């Protein structure tokens, strides 16, 4: 309206740049467009037009009055066929980058809440220390420590101790006994809270205590008597817990080793301390009494001393890990103190040990890859921010090059994950900052490139206004259950190439428009792509590394025909496809085998919606309908066809079994979760297990052609009794390596592993 000092000075600054028009003018006349859009009356002095009708585009159109958008904007990079050389791309990036800049980390995890059980069982027969597989002999490494800090950092709850105890106390209360009608503990009971702290997390005391005292334990009510014994204590006393301290008798001994020392190199001292306060906790127990032992570093030698020195006088063993952060801190929850017992190491306890350690390890390897605190952009970090800026917007077309290429470049680096553009409200050079995040994933795709398509300039030009800058952040928001589960199938793909990530001639059955498959396949791989939907955006353009696009929908009669590969990837797709067809799943599947029978194919990755075991409905997710053997998916509405396991098995059996029969074991294993972390994604631990459940109903049935039939029979005499069957075509002296992702149950001849209940 009335132009600001600010805006005029901006506009002028802009004007006093470079670049020249087409329709010049003589100074004797005014020259008003020969293409008669202009409303040119008969003016006194102006003749008309420029005298010289040349050639250039024009058109009519009004301006969309769009307000200043106080939000960062996303960009779909629709591509145009003018394909810059890698070096130039890179170069131009270098030229326009606003990067390096100090990356707001955010969070690794948004919700670090889980309870990992360890338990008693009537299963220990001959399992001594000598059975127990010793801790990672490597656990104190530079990199490994950084990892723990990194993760810890990138999780801010502050109510760590709270969640902790509330969980344990729920667990401990859960020991409800028939014979008495009551739990282990009644009302107005006893706590020996030892290893106590001034917990400055809004309370200035242990957050738990106040709640317990007041009645904040589901099911069990109040204690009487609680102590705050320690070192950094406010309501209690200064005692050295480990040594011989004033013998007072308590029912619930909560021992807490705040392991405060620099010199972690002394493992002996670490265990001898634990031993000492284990003693003291026994000295402390009233007749029958329970005790909790928060121990940091577990080991064989510890478990040893427990067994040997204590078990005698304890009836029951429980243990837990509050899974907040990634660390080795177990809670030894023992029951029935100062009484006779003949406790021994349990199969349960073993499995749980292994699972824990493995969780730790898997997450460890991932996290180690994440950028540290106060890291400038080095190019190298698995994650980081590469943003380029456009100094006074020269979007234009292909011919412009330097803008378009830098753009392009940024898009090659990022590969459909992150992609922002914003024309910043600013007075002077009007910056149109373009922002991205590098990933290991994006790199893989970049590597497969020949060249970089300068995307269609027009998609950008559509935004005629002012858009505010992004805040700049590494991490995002949260982990959607559904997306976790898809990512887990994807991980599985990646890591099962041929003969252990061994280069792969495959197909994509149902190539999503974005082609994420390419980002999962190593750049060397030789791929077929059935993109049923008409895809244009970064689709086939660069054929070199065999990107064999076969448009159209395979499900139809005759079309599959032409396709050769050795891995046919179908996750979810098949589901949808059978619904489309309105057919007996049996029949459809069946027809699909002969199909693929005629092709040069090995890995059939058939992820039908089928249960692995006993059907449980998953509300607000998966609802199961049998009458028409379909999932009614809760996210709005998604009709996903489902099959029971036995009719499937029944159909396979009836046909033939001439193939390898493998299921993708996602539900315990941490390994696929690094994938998730990898794409700048605030994990959730409760969202993890939910997915975990859901997998069991949506697994990838991996069926391999040219292989020995696998023989599964689990139907006769189940009932905690026994199945019968034969494993064929094997050497007279066989060493029967049967395992559960390392978890060696069944060794064959190596029977020293018989860990099964049964």
């Amino acid at each position: 309206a009335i132009p600001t000092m600010s805006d005029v000075r901006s506009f002028v600054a802009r004007l006093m740049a470079e670049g020249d028009p087409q329709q010049w003018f003589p100074y004797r006349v005014d020259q008003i467009l020969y293409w008669p859009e202009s409303p040119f009356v008969p003016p006194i002095g102006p003749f008309y037009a420029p005298f010289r009708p040349v050639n250039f585009p024009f058109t009519t159109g009004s301006y969309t009055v769009v307000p200043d958008a106080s939000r960062p904007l996303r960009l779909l990079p629709q591509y145009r066929n003018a394909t810059i050389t890698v070096q130039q791309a890179d170069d131009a990036y270098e030229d326009t980058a606003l990067s390096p800049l100090i990356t707001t980390h955010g969070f690794c995890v948004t919700g670090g809440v889980f309870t990992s059980i360890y338990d008693i069982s009537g299963d220990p027969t001959a399992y001594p220390p000598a059975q127990l597989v010793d801790a990672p002999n490597d656990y104190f490494d530079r990199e490994r420590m950084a990892r723990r800090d990194l993760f810890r950092r990138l999780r801010a709850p502050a109510d760590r101790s709270a969640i902790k105890d509330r969980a344990v106390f729920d667990f401990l209360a859960s020991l409800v006994n028939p014979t008495t009608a009551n739990p282990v503990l009644d009302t107005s009971f006893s706590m020996a809270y030892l290893g106590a702290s001034s917990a400055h997390a809004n309370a200035d005391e242990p957050v738990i205590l106040a709640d317990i005292r007041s009645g904040s334990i589901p099911g069990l009510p109040i204690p009487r008597r609680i102590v705050q014994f320690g070192y950094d204590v406010v309501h209690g006393s200064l005692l050295d817990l480990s040594r011989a301290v004033p013998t007072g008798t308590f029912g619930l001994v909560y021992a807490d080793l705040d392991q405060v020392e620099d010199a972690g190199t002394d493992m002996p001292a670490a265990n001898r301390a634990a031993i000492a306060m284990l003693g003291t906790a026994l000295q402390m127990t009233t007749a029958g009494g329970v005790s909790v032992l928060k121990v940091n570093f577990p080991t064989r030698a510890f478990w040893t001393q427990v067994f040997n020195l204590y078990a005698t006088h304890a009836t029951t063993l429980h243990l837990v890990k509050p899974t907040i952060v990634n660390s080795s801190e177990v809670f030894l929850v023992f029951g029935g103190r100062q009484s006779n017992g003949a406790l021994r190491s349990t199969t349960a306890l073993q499995r749980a040990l292994l699972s824990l350690y493995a969780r730790n390890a898997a997450i460890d390897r991932a996290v180690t890859h994440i950028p540290f605190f106060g890291v400038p952009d080095d190019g190298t970090s698995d994650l980081g921010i590469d943003a380029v800026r456009l100094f006074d917007p020269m979007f234009s077309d292909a011919v412009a090059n330097l803008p378009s290429n830098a753009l392009a470049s940024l898009v090659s680096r990022v590969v459909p994950s992150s992609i922002m553009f914003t024309r910043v409200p600013s007075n002077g050079p009007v910056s149109t900052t373009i922002y991205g995040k590098r990933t290991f994933l994006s790199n893989r795709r970049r590597a497969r490139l020949r060249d970089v398509p300068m995307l269609i300039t027009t998609t950008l030009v559509h935004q005629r206004r002012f858009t505010t800058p992004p805040t700049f952040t590494l991490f995002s928001s949260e982990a959607v259950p559904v997306t976790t589960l898809v990512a887990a199938g994807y991980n599985s793909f990646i890591s099962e190439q041929t003969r252990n990530p061994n280069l792969a001639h495959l197909l994509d059955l149902g190539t999503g428009p974005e082609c994420r498959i390419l980002s999962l396949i190593p750049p060397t791989l030789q791929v077929t792509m059935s993109d049923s939907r008409p895809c244009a955006e970064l689709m086939a353009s660069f054929d070199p590394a065999l990107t064999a696009y076969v448009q159209g929908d395979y499900s139809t009669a005759a079309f599959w025909n032409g396709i050769r590969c050795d891995s046919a990837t179908a996750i979810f797709t098949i589901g949808a496809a059978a619904a489309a067809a309105g057919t007996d799943l049996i029949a459809f599947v069946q027809q699909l085998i002969p199909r693929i029978v005629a092709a040069g194919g090995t890995r059939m990755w058939l992820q039908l919606n089928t249960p692995l075991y006993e059907v449980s409905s998953l509300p607000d997710l998966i609802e199961i309908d049998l009458r028409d053997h379909v999932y009614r998916f809760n996210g709005g509405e998604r009709v996903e066809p489902y099959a029971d396991p036995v009719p499937l098995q029944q159909a396979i059996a009836a046909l033939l079994p001439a193939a390898a029969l493998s299921w993708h074991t996602l539900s315990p294993t941490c390994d696929w979760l690094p994938y998730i972390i990898g794409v700048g994604s605030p994990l959730n631990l409760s969202d993890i297990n939910t997915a975990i459940s859901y997998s069991r109903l949506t697994p990838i049935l991996h069926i391999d052609t040219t292989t020995p039939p696998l023989r599964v029979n689990p139907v006769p005499t189940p009932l905690n009794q026994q199945c019968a069957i034969r494993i064929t075509s094997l050497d007279p002296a066989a060493v029967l390596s049967v395992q559960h992702n390392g978890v060696e149950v069944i060794g064959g001849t190596p029977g020293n592993v018989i860990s099964v209940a049964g």
Binding site: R80, N81, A82, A398, V399, I456
Partner: protein
């Protein structure tokens, strides 16, 4: 003694007079449809051999 110029990434042989002349002509075929290429957004921009 002679060593060939930079085959490496550039400086090669004396160009075929005929091949230049020919090739430029070929480019002109495409040029015959320039307005259409352009409209199709199909990298139209006349090469300039």
């Amino acid at each position: 003694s002679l060593a060939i110029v930079s085959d490496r990434f550039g400086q090669y042989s004396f160009v075929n007079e005929g091949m230049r002349e020919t090739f430029s002509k070929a480019l002109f075929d495409i040029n015959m449809w320039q307005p259409l290429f352009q409209a199709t957004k199909t990298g139209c921009g006349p090469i300039v051999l």
